[PDB]
Each structure stands twice: as C-alpha cells, then as structure tokens.
Design a protein around this ligand. Sequence first.
Ligand SMILES: [Cl-]
Ligand SMILES: [Co+2]
Ligand SMILES: [Co+2]
Ligand SMILES: [Co+2]
Ligand SMILES: [Co+2]
Ligand SMILES: [Co+2]
Lengths: 145, 140
Amino acid sequence: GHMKDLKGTKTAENLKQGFIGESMANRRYLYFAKRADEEGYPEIAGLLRSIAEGETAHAFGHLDFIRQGGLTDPATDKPIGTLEQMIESAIAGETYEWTQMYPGFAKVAREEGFPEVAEWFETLARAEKSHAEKFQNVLKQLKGG
Amino acid sequence: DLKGTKTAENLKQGFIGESMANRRYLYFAKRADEEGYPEIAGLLRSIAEGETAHAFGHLDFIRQGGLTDPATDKPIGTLEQMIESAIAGETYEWTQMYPGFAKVAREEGFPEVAEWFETLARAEKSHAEKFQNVLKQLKG
Ligand SMILES: [Cl-]
Ligand SMILES: [Co+2]
Ligand SMILES: [Co+2]
Ligand SMILES: [Co+2]
Ligand SMILES: [Co+2]
Ligand SMILES: [Co+2]
C-alpha cells in the first residue's frame, strides 16, 4: 500500500508543508547550537544537534512518502524518482535561483537601501550559477555513462 | 530598519529555499551512495555545505536586523529566545499541525501516511518537553 497515488490530495500538500517545516527546523537548531557553543552550554548544544537529527529523519521520511506517492520535489515541482531526475531537480532549482530569485532579491535590496544584503544576494546568485554548472557536468556524465 | 520591507520577506524566502536545498541534496546523496557514484555523492554533500552557509547567512541578517524566525515569527536574538522559538514551533506541530495532517490522511484513505504523521506528533511533543527543560535550566 506504499505506492497509493497521492496526486491531487490534501495529504500531498501536507507532506510538502511538513517537508518545508522539517527542513527549516534542522537549519534553525544547528544555528542555535552555535550560540550555545560560544556561550559554554555543551549539553544544550548537543541536545539541539540530536533533535536536529530527528528533524532530518522527519524530512527524509516526508520525501520518501512524496516519491512513493507519485509526487514532485517540494522545491521545484520536478519528479525525483531516479538519480538522474534528482540531479535535474537540483539543476532546475539552482537555475531559478541564479537566473531570477537572487538577482531579483539583490535589485530590491539595493532599491530599499540595503547594499550589504544586496552584496550577499549577488554572492549567492554567483554561487548558485557555479552549483548549476557543476550539477550540469555531472548529469552529462550520468547520461553518457 | 529591515522590519516591514520586501528585503525582510526575501531573507525569509531565501532561508526557506536554502533549508530545503540542504535537505534535498543530502537525500539525493544517499541514492548516489547506493548506486556507486561517490563523486556525485561527494559533490551533493559539498554543495549542501554551501547551502548551510547560505541559510545561516540569511539568519545572520535576520537576527542582526531584529527580524523574527522564519518558522515561528518569534525573536531569535538571545539563546533563551532561540529556545523559546524552538518550543513554539514544536508546540504548534504536536498540538495542531501533525494531528491535523494525520486526520486528513486517515479521511483521504492513507492510513500509512496518517501513522507517520501520528509518530511525528508524538516526536515533536517529546522535543517540546526536552526544550522546555532547557529553558528552565537557562531562565533559572
Ligand atoms: Cl549546557
Ligand atoms: Co505498498
Ligand atoms: Co520534526
Ligand atoms: Co545551490
Ligand atoms: Co544556496
Ligand atoms: Co521537533
């Protein structure tokens, strides 16, 4: 019963929302752990890091149900059944970010008078272009053998 | 002041995207691992570290600008505030979000998915309690 079709269901949408929240929880808790680290709270830092592993398990399980239910990647709306498809999903999202999202964010940051945040968004646009090209070169290797 | 700007929203959306990218690439790496593509797995893992740096830098600008946590809309300036943000999100998840998802899954005919969401509700309740015990240790 693991392969029941989830397309068009509310449950499909709920898996995507769960994946988003679990992804953020891991990042948040590892960021908070660094504050605990600096201040000298190793037990708190360690708890944050261990709970973060929990949120990894939660996120990965949501992606298993997404993949098995015939759903697409929460970030890109691309299929992620095969390794080739996974890499194509990575390329699609990186391409969105370097062609559109980060340059757009930089332009708006400059307009609103946040040049330091704009510089950061421009760095990230260049970074996601580098990422897209490296994934493009790997895909070429996969599809060539 | 970043509060109420479009740049504040774009930092929040950047954080969301970057958080998902790290999770996605580490998940994809496991498939590369199984199939015998260590260079592809390694690349996914190294790029994933890039996306960690991106997400953390978004949180730096958020925290420095006095903006709230993307996940909870709670302040994250101090360690105590960070633990309070963790508690608020976990409490929403176990009291509302996961039980609600479970009910919808059951009602749509997906018992296995519902069981998963009920597991996660219990897990987030355990997380919340462990964070509440941390906050007691700090605030006291
Ligand atoms: Cl401690
Ligand atoms: Co089955
Ligand atoms: Co979780
Ligand atoms: Co990237
Ligand atoms: Co990134
Ligand atoms: Co949790």
